[PDB]
Amino acid sequence: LIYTAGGYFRQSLSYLEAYNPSDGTWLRLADLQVPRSGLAGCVVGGLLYAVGGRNNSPDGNTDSSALDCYNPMTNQWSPCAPMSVPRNRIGVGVIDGHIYAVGGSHGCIHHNSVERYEPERDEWHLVAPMLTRRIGVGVAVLNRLLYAVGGFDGTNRLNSAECYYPERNEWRMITAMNTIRSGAGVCVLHNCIYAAGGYDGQDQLNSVERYDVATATWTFVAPMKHRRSALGITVHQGRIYVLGGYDGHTFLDSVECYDPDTDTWSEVTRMTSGRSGVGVAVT
Numbered sequence: 067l068i069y070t071a072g073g074y075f076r077q078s079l080s081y082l083e084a085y086n087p088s089d090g091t092w093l094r095l096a097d098l099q100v101p102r103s104g105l106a107g108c109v110v111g112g113l114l115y116a117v118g119g120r121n122n123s124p125d126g127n128t129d130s131s132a133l134d135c136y137n138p139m140t141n142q143w144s145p146c147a148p149m150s151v152p153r154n155r156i157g158v159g160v161i162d163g164h165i166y167a168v169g170g171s172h173g174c175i176h177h178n179s180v181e182r183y184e185p186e187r188d189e190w191h192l193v194a195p196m197l198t199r200r201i202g203v204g205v206a207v208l209n210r211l212l213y214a215v216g217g218f219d220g221t222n223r224l225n226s227a228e229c230y231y232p233e234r235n236e237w238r239m240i241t242a243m244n245t246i247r248s249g250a251g252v253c254v255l256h257n258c259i260y261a262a263g264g265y266d267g268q269d270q271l272n273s274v275e276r277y278d279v280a281t282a283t284w285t286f287v288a289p290m291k292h293r294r295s296a297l298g299i300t301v302h303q304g305r306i307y308v309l310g311g312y313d314g315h316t317f318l319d320s321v322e323c324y325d326p327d328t329d330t331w332s333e334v335t336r337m338t339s340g341r342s343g344v345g346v347a348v349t
Contacts, residue, residue, distance in 0.1 A: 074103030107345030118156035157205030204252025251299030
């Protein structure tokens, strides 16, 4: 199933919903302990993690360092050890069963720092920081290497990307995208990386490009039907799924699915309500 957690639709949300691409159904599950937008989702050992984000509520706003873990076999959430700092609009990747939290913001602070969480010990540890401060960064893992893509450094929105080597513990700049992207959806599909949509400081984007590591090159592919920033993204059975986002006018419930073999996007469902800044994963 495709789990979407949190999000934002004029206030941070606590929804945890699961989409079945063959049923078509949306399953309503245990609410998040705390409403959170701008978080990230990932899956380790079959367990679904919600990382970072921010609680926007009528009673106030606070960025979040929380890491929470959801068990589909119990339909229950359990808090884990928190990150060293709150990370709103965070990116996460998974390497060797460890969770890498990347970038984000905390008030006026624009993080270049990165930390790694170990599920078997419930410990976070800071690793080497990025060459760039990145809010709204896209993160993807290719052959056990961690790519951070795009974002917003507090002043400029970025098309640069960098690559983290865990055992050397260091970041190195790679070829930049063709499109400056903040809050894009970044994932790994088949044998390449995909950055889709986002915000360049003027327009919300529908363009999609993918990075090939062999040619170290970005190539434009079939764009989406709906421009969207702060979208959620995941890969299910060899197809890309993008959920919600913000098109500069309304918070979308559109869900689009990219078929790589045909280079085609198509709408497959609508979420139960429009929202942006969700965390998405599959388990």
